[PDB]
């Protein structure tokens, strides 16, 4: 996956968390990044088209990460979009529920750029990107 212009959507209700993820992506060379504050905001942006990767917080108001993921996976236009779930605390039950709903990966925050890079590269490889 050599497309450094792959378009990311970073979804989290905390603006500071979004800025952290955006800055880590920038460090890796991924600058084509937009933000959303909950699952509905995210879906509105995704329908505008052009996105290549979603990084979503697990716990958000109104529409949480699991519901966002399910909605993406059920939509024929975006059903193959990579989705990386982010959580403050790994839980077996959540990991399995996310996998059942089609998550591409799952990672615990706070994470470093190196950890993010590894997550992304393993997802790109798993998905044949
Ligand atoms: Mn949150």
The domains located in the chain, with CATH, are 1-129 (3.40.50.2300)
Q: How far is the CA of 9 from the centre of ligand 1 (A)?
A: 15
Technique that determined the structure: X-ray
Q: What letter would DSSP give residue 83?
A: E
Q: How far is the CA of 64 from the centre of ligand 1 (A)?
A: 8
Question: CA-CA distance, 46 to 81, in Å (whole number)?
Answer: 10
Tell me the residues surrounding ligand 1 (ion) with CB < 5 Å.
Answer: 13, 57, 59
Tell me the C-alpha to C-alpha distance, in Å, between residue 56 and each of 2, 8, 10, 30, 88.
22, 10, 6, 16, 12
Q: How far is the CA of 56 from the centre of ligand 1 (A)?
A: 9
What residues are paired with 85 via a beta bridge?
56, 106
Could you give the 3-state DSSP secondary structure of residue 33?
strand
Question: CA-CA distance, 96 to 4, in Å (whole number)?
Answer: 30
Total residues found in the chain within this entry: 129
Alpha helices in the chain (DSSP H): 15-28, 39-47, 65-74, 92-100, 113-127
Q: How far is the CA of 107 from the centre of ligand 1 (A)?
A: 14
Q: How far is the CA of 13 from the centre of ligand 1 (A)?
A: 5
Resolution in A: 1.2
Maximum alpha-carbon separation in the chain: 35
Question: CA-CA distance, 113 to 58, in Å (whole number)?
Answer: 20
């Amino acid at each position: 996956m050599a497309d450094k212009e792959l378009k990311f959507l970073v979804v989290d209700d905390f603006s500071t968390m979004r800025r952290i993820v955006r800055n880590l992506l920038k460090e890796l060379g991924f600058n084509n990044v937009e933000e959303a504050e909950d699952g509905v905001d995210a879906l509105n942006k995704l329908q505008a088209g052009g996105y290549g990767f979603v990084i979503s917080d697990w716990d958000m108001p109104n529409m949480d990460g699991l519901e966002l993921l399910k909605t993406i996976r059920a939509d024929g236009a975006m059903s193959a979009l990579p989705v990386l779930m982010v959580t403050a605390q790994a839980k077996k039950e959540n990991i399995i529920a996310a996998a059942q709903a089609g998550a591409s990966g799952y990672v615990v925050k706070p994470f470093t750029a190196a950890t993010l890079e590894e997550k992304l590269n393993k997802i790109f490889e798993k998905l044949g990107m």
